Design a protein around this motif. Sequence first.
Motif: not given
Lengths: 499, 499, 499, 499
Positions: D439, D191, D302, D198, D234, D210, D200
Motif C-alpha cells: 500500500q 506506510h 475506496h 508528506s 472529513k 480529517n 499533511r
Amino acid sequence: NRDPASDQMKHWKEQRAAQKPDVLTTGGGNPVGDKLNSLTVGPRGPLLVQDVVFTDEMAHFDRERIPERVVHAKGAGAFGYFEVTHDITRYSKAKVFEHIGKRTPIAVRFSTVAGESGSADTVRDPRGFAVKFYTEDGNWDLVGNNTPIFFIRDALLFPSFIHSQKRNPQTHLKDPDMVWDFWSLRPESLHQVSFLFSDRGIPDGHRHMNGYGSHTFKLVNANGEAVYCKFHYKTDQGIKNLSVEDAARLAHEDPDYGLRDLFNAIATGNYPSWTLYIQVMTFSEAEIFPFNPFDLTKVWPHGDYPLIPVGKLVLNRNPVNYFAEVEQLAFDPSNMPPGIEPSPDKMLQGRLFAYPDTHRHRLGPNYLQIPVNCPYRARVANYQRDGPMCMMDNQGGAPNYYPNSFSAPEHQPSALEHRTHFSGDVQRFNSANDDNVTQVRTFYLKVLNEEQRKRLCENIAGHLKDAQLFIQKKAVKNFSDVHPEYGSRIQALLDKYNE
Amino acid sequence: NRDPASDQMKHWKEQRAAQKPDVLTTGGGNPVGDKLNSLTVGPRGPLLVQDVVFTDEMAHFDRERIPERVVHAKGAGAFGYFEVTHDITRYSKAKVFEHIGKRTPIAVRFSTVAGESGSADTVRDPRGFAVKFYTEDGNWDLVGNNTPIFFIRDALLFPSFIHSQKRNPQTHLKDPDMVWDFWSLRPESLHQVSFLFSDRGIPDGHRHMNGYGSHTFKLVNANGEAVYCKFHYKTDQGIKNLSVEDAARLAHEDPDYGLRDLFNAIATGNYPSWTLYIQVMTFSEAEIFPFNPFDLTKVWPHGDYPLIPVGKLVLNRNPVNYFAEVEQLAFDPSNMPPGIEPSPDKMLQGRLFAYPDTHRHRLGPNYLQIPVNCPYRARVANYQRDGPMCMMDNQGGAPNYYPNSFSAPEHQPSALEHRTHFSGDVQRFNSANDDNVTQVRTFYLKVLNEEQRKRLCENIAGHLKDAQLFIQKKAVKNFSDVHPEYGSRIQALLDKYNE
Amino acid sequence: NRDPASDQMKHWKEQRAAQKPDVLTTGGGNPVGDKLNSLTVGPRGPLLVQDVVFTDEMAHFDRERIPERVVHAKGAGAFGYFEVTHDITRYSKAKVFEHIGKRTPIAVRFSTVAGESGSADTVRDPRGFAVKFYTEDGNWDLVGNNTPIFFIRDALLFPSFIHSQKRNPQTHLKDPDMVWDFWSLRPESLHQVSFLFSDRGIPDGHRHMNGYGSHTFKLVNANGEAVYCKFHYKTDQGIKNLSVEDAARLAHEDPDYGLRDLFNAIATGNYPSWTLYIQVMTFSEAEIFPFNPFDLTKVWPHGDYPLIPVGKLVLNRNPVNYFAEVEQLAFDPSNMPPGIEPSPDKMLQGRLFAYPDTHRHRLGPNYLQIPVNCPYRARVANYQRDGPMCMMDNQGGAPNYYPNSFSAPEHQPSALEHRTHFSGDVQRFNSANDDNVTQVRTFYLKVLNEEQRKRLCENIAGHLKDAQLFIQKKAVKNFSDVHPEYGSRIQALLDKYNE
Amino acid sequence: NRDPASDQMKHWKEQRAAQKPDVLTTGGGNPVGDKLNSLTVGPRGPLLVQDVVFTDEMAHFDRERIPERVVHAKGAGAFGYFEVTHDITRYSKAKVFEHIGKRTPIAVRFSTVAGESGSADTVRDPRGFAVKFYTEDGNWDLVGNNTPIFFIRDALLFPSFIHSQKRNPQTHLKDPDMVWDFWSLRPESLHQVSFLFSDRGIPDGHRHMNGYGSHTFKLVNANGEAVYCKFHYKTDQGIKNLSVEDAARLAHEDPDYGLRDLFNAIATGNYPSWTLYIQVMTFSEAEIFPFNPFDLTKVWPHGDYPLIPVGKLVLNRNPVNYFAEVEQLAFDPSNMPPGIEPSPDKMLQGRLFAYPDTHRHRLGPNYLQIPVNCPYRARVANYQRDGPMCMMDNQGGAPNYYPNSFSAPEHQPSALEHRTHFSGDVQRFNSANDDNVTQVRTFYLKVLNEEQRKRLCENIAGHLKDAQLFIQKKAVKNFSDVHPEYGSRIQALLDKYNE
Ligand SMILES: NC(=O)C1=CN([C@@H]2O[C@H](COP(=O)(O)OP(=O)(O)OC[C@H]3O[C@@H](n4cnc5c(N)ncnc54)[C@H](OP(=O)(O)O)[C@@H]3O)[C@@H](O)[C@H]2O)C=CC1
C-alpha cells in the motif's frame, strides 16, 4: 562525528562491548521469552489477561509521569563540589566552612520560571540556580536565582504573580493583560522588571550568569554571635547574553539549548565554576539601614557592604539518568545546618513552609529517601516512622517515642537557634509603599550606559504594547516615577506601536 | 519475667547497652536541639512557622497510614526458607525445585479475610497463608488459604461476595441478611460453607493449620511437557482447633492471639514447618475428570490423585519492623518463574489482573522496589522507567526502547509459555449449575463423624438464625439438597432459635 | 422482627416497592448484559481482555479503601441542627449566635482514639465528639472530646504520645511498657490519666457523655472587644457509664455497640441532644489566673467561672451512606468564622496546621469539595484553582489573580482578626513543670467519693501491672505526688498483682 | 481592538458590569479581611502559623498540577453536537444512530503526540482528534487521529515506539538515532512515516485536517447481525497545510497557533464541522481480503469499499475553564454502546485496557464522576462503591451486592455482545512480516504527484541525516523496498547532507 550528547547511546554501548546483554525480565524478576508479540488465541484473535508481561510493562508505562514543578519546571542539572578558599569562621560555625581546602559534594539545577517542561531555553525570564550542599550537619539548600532581588516582598502575593506570568484560565494562552495589570498595580516590581528587560534577561546558557541567595540570611559563629548576610556566586566564565534576534531563532532551532550547552561543557572537560561571596551586615547596621534590610526588592550596595570571598562552586559530573537525578531533585530553603539561619524576610518566611509542602505532593511523603535528596553524609535518626513507599529499615526496632528510657536518639543542645528579641503588634503590616524607585533610579542612570537604556525600553515596549491602553498608561506612569526619561522613551515607542 | 514479645524493648536496649544513643535529627539529617518544647514568642505566646522541627515530624505523623488491604487486612508475618527433599523435576523445570537440598528464602503472611486492621484473631473465617519464594528466575508467589476450595467459581462474583462479608453500606455493621442472601442465592458456596463452620473454622493460631493453593496450576518440564497440579503444604505441628467458647474469650482477652503466638514460638526456637505436597493430573485425566478440574469449589480426591511430597517450609525469623516487612508485603499470583503456569480456572484468571492492580494503589506504582517486595535473587532488567518514588538508579542510561542496535537486555526464548489449544465460542458461559452437592455429601457423611456433624449444624444455625425467614428457608433447602438430614438438623435448631 | 438497624435492607426495598429496578451499567453508563459469567473462549477457557465489564468492576473494587484516620479511626456519625436559646452576642459576633431561635445544620462524628477501624467501641479510651456547624460565614469545626483536658500541653509531644498508645513497631502489639514509660516520664498526664481510669472512661453509648471544646478560645463581638471562653456541651440524656465487666462482654458480643446505639436511637425518634455552654475569662482575669489559662491539662473552676448556656445541639438524622457522609468527614479547628478565634494554646496552635494537612493526604487536595465537607451555605469565591479531582466549574473563567481591575472577589475589612500585643524572646520555653498535681488532688478528694477512688485505683493497677517494675515505681511516685493515699493504694494493689 | 482570544478578561468584566464582585473567601467559605499582607509579629517580624489565610491558599497552589498525559499532552478543546443525516440502522442499532436528525452532545480534543504541555503546535507529528458522544446508552468515545493508519500493529511495541519519539533517558534530548533505529528496525512503519513526512504532517491548525478511527470496528444491528466498519470524519473546511518554512516561524512566533485558531473561530460564529462516513466489510469479504483486515497499518481502498455518509460533527462552543473541561477530559476506547464493538485488531485490544488504566493514575479512581467525563445523558447504576474522592451520594444506601432479592439494578439481556467463533493455538504469533510495502508503493506512485514525491524525500532526509550512517543505510533500504526511486532520491540527498 557529532557533539558528545548526540552520541550518548553510542558510548553506552562501547563502554559495555566487553559484556553480554542482560536477560530481559518483568518487574518481578521473571525472564521474558517474547516481548514483541502479544499472547492471543490465534493469529488474528483477541488478547488474554494471561499476558501479564504486557500488563507488567504497560501498567508502568501508564504511571511514568509525575506532576511537573509548579514553577521552574524546565531545568538542567549537574553535579560537582564546593571548596573553601577563605576563612569566614568568625561569621559561621557551619561545618561547610570549617577549614580552607574543605570540599563538599553539591548538586545544581538550573531553570527558567514560567514555561512548562516542553518550552524553550532561550526566552526572557529569570533563571533558577538552586544549590544543595551535602554536609555532615545534614543538607544545606541555597535556592537562588540569577538575580539578587524579586518582583514582590510579601509571600501572599506570590501565587497571584505566578498566575499572572502563566496561562489564562480560559484560553490557556500567555496573556499580556495579566502580566502588566499586576506589575502596574504593584510598582515594587519596578526593580526586578528593569533587570529582566535588560540584556541579561536572556543568558547565553547557564554557565554565563551569576547566582544570588537574594534573601537576607543569618550566620551564627561558635560564640553565639550573629550577623546578617547576602550570598553572591559569580560566573568565572564571564557574563554573556543572547541578543533578542538570536534568542528567537534558537527558540525553535534548539529548544534545549541550555540543556545541551551544560551537558557538552562538562563532557568535554570544560568544567564551569562559580565564586561564592558574601556580604555582611551587623545587627546594628541593620537598624540604621535606610531601606528595609529584609525587603527582597533591595540590594545592599557594594561600596558600603563589599563582597567577602568564601569558596568556589565547580560542576564536573553529568547525570546518568535525568529523571532519577534531576527531575526528582527537591531543594528546601528550610534545610539549614547549624550556623546558618533565616532572616525575618517575609518572602523567605513563606518559602520555609512552601517547598517541603509541595515536595510531599509532587514526589511523595518520603521524598527525602530518594537518593539525590537523601542526606547521605549525615546520620538520620529520629522518631518518624511509616509513610508511603518506605525504603530503609524504617529505623528498625528502635523506640519511636520521645522521651524514653531505652536510649533512642537525643537532642543536641549546641544546635539550638539564635535568640532574637521582637516586639510589636501581631498584625498585617502594609509593605506596598516602601521605597519603590530609589535603587531603580541608580540602576537606570549609573549602571547602564546609553545603549543599554535604549535596548531596555525597546524590550519593555515590544511586550507592553499588547496590553490595553489604560494598563499601558498605568505602567508608563510607574516608569516615570523612576525617571521621566525612562517612561517618556517607552511612551514614545508605544505611541508608534499603537499605529 | 514475661513472654518474649513483651520484652521487645527490654532486649532492644540490652543489645545496645554498650554504644551511645544516636543524635536525634530531622528527616534532613539536621540535629535538633530540643524536641519537647515548641518555638513560641514568650512562655504563653503563639507558635511560629520557623519551628521546622515541629512541621517535619508532625507532617510525617500525618502521613503514617496507607490504605489497608481490601481483604485479608489483619495479618501476621514471619520469614524462613523452603528446602527441596524429593525430586519432582520430571514435572517442573522451575529452578526452585532444581535439586534436593536446594534452599530458597521465603516470606509468609497469615491473615483472616473479613476483619479490619484492629479486629480479633480468634474468629470464624478462612485464613490466609501466602508464601513468597525468592528464586533465581524471579519471585514465585504461592498465595493460598487454609482451604483447598473457595466459596464461588467465577471472579465476577468476588466483589459481591466480599461486600456481603463486610459491613452494611448504611449502618456499617455486619449484616446476616447480606451474608445468607448471597450464600443461599449461590449454592456453589455449599462446599466451602460446610468447611467453614466445622472445627477448622477457628484454628489455634497459624501454626496448627494446613495451607493450600486451591486452584489448579500447570507445571512445565525441560521437554515442554505439561501436567496440572494442586499445592498442599501440611502443618507439621498438627491440626488443632479452638472451641467456640475459647475463641470468644480470647477474642476480647487477646485480640492479637495469633500474632503473639507466632512471634513467641519463633523467638524461643520452636520453629514451625509445613510439608509441601503436590497432586498431579494429566491432560487426558482432565478431559475425563467427572467434574470441571478447574472448578475452585472442587478438590482432587486422594484415592485417585495421591499426595506427592516435594519439600519443607520452615519459619525461623521474626520481622524487625512489622510495617516495613509485613504490612508492605505484596503477593501476586502472576509472579510465576519458568516451570509454573496458570490453569484456565476462571477464578485464577481474575487474580492475575487484580493483585498487581491493587498493589499499585495501596503501595505505589513502584511497589516492587520496596525491599521485602524486591526480587533480590534475580537480575531485573527491562524497558520500564520512571514512576513515582523511583529508588534505584532507574536502570542508568541504558537504551529504554526495544528492539535496538545498542545491546539493551534481550528476551530469553526458553522462557516461552506452554501452548495449549482451545476452540469455542467467545461468550459468557453459565457455571452456576456445576455439581454443587456431590463432594459435600461425601464430606458430611464420610469425613465428619457423628459428633462433628452435630457441631457443624449448631454453628450454622447459630449464625443463620438472625437472617430473615425467607433466607433461612432457602439456605436450608440447599443444605437439604446435600443430604436431607443435614437440612433437618439445621431446621430443627432454627425452629428453636426462632422462639 | 428485629431492631431498625438490622432491617435496613428490608426498609430500602419497601421504600421502592412501587418502582422497577434500575438498569445495571458499567461506570460509563453502558448497560451490562451479564455480570455473573466472565467472557471466555469456550466454557473451560481463558478470560479475555475484551471483558471490560469485569475490569471496570474489579478496577474499582481494587481502589475501594482510603487511609483511615491516623487517630480516632473508629467512629459513628449523625446529622442535626444547632439552635440558639440564649443571647451571647455581647461576647461573639458570629452569625451562628446572631439571634435566639436561629438554626444551623450540624454534622457530628463520635469516636474512640487509638483502636483502628475494626476495634471495639466499649474500651477504656477518650471519646471524640466533633461538631461541624455550617455557617453562612463558612464552616465552624468545634473538634471536641468527651473531656475538658488532655494528656500533654505541647503539640511536639503529640506524635510521641500517640505512638506510645498504639502498637509496638516490631510486634504490632499494644505495649504496656510504651504506655506507662511515656505517662510516667510526662507527669502532666496525671490530670487526664485520672479522668480516663475513672468511671467515665467507658461511656454507655455516645448519647450518655458530654462534649467539651477543651481548648481556651477567643470570642470577638462587633465593637472589637474580645474574651476567652470554653465550650461545654452536656448530654441531655444523663451521664451513664459501663462497668469493666459489662464493657468486656460487649467487646466481643457487639464490637460496634455505640454505632448500633446511635443509629437505633435516631431511627426510633429518640433523638439525642446536648446543651451548649460557655465559660468566659476576660483578658485581665487571664493575667492573674493562678495557672496558665491556655494550659490544656487545666480547667476553669465552675464556682469562679460558671456555665453560661447558649443553645441546643440535636441529632435527628442517620447517614444514608456511611462512607461518603461519615468516613469522608473532615473537621478542621482552623475553620473558624469571624467572631471566633484561637487562644495561644500551644496544642491548639499546632492543631491549626495538622488537620488540613492530613486531610489532603487522607482524602486529597480538593477534600473540601466533598458534599459533606462543603460549606454549602456560604459562597466560596477566591483565586485558588485546579488540583486533583476538580469537581465544580473551577470558578469559571474568572480572573485568577489578586489584585486585578476586572472585579473578581474582594476582601471584607470587617472580617479581620482581633489584634493582641505580645512581647518576649522567640525561643522554646519549658512548660514541663507547670503545676501538675493541684487540680488532680482536688479531683481525687472532692469530686470522687470513697467508692470511686477505690475503682479508680483498681483500674490503674489492673493495666499498670504488666509494665516493668522500674516503670511502676515511677508512676506510683507521680501518683503519690498527687496524694500519698493515691499512690499507696495503687502500690498495695500492684504488690499483690506481682504475686 | 484585538482578536476575541485576547479580550477574554475584557468580556468577562463586561458580562458582569451590572453585579458587584463576590466576597473573597477561604476554601472553607470564610471571608478574608486582607489577602495581600501576611500575619507577622511587628512589621519586620516572623510569620505565624495562625495565618491560615496564607496556608490555605499556598497549600492549594502547591497542588495545582496533576500528571500530564503520557502521550498527546498538548491539546485544545471544544464542545458542540453530532447530528445524523443518513440511515445506517441496517448495520448498527446504536442509539446515537437511531433516526435522521437525532442530535447528541459531543466533546472533542485535538493534540500532537510527542510534545509535552509547553511545546509548539506547528510541528511535524500526527494529530489526535478524540470525540466523546454522550448518548443515552452511556458515553461513546471514538478516539481517532488525523491518519487512517499507525506505525505498528502490536501493542507490546507501543511503549517502545513512544520512548523512541520522546527524550533520551540521560540527556533528556530528542535523539534522531532513537527515532530511526526503531523505524529502520520495524519497517511496518513505512506506510505511516510516508504520510507523516508528506505535506499533511503539519496541518494549518485543527480545522483543516480529517479524522479517522483507524481501527476496524464492529457494528451490530437489532437483529443480531454484524459487520466490520471504518469511521472517516472529513473536514468541511478543506485540507490545508503549513510549509516547513512557515511552520517553523510560527513555532516561535505563536507556540499555541492551533489553539488560538480554534477558539477565535468559534468565538466569531465561524464554526468548524466535519462529515462522518463509514466503510463496511462483511464477515465474508473479511475472509478473502488480501491483507489482514485488522492490521492497523492497512487501509481499505475506496474503490472496493466506498464511503457511506452518516452525519456531521460540529464545534459551536468553547471551554469556559480549560483545566476543568479540557485537561481533565478522559477518553476511553472501551466506552462503547450496544451496536458498536471492537474488532480483533491487536492494537485496539491493548487500548481496551491501557486508557482506563492511565486515567485512574492521571486523574484518579473516580475520574468518571468528573463533570465533563460524566455520562450525563445516561443513568449510572450498579454495585461499585467508595474510592478516593467520591462525589455524589455513592448510590446511597442501595444494596451493594449482586445478585440480590432486594431490587437493586438488573442486567439488560439485549446489551449482550455478538458471538464470534475463534479457533487456533493460544500463543504469540509473529506479525512483523505482514506486507510492509504494497500500500505504500501505491501511495508514493499513485496518490502523490511529482512535486509531492520530491518534498516527501526532502522532509525525510533533513531529519534522517542526523542519524548514524549504519542507521541511514538501513532506513533507505526500507525505502528502496517500497520503490527503487524512493530509496534513491533519499540517498542522493543524504549524500549531500553528509558533506
Ligand atoms: N483508502 C483509504 O481509506 C485511504 C487511503 N489512503 C492512501 O491511499 C492509498 C490508496 O488508497 P485508494 O483508496 O486505493 O486510492 P484513493 O485515491 O481512492 O485514496 C486516496 C486518498 O489519499 C489521501 N491523501 C491525499 N494526500 C495525502 C497525504 N499527503 N497523506 C495522506 N493521505 C493523503 C486522500 O484522503 P482524503 O482525500 O480522504 O482527505 C484520498 O482519499 C492507500 O494505499 C493509502 O496509502 C489515505 C487515506 C485514506
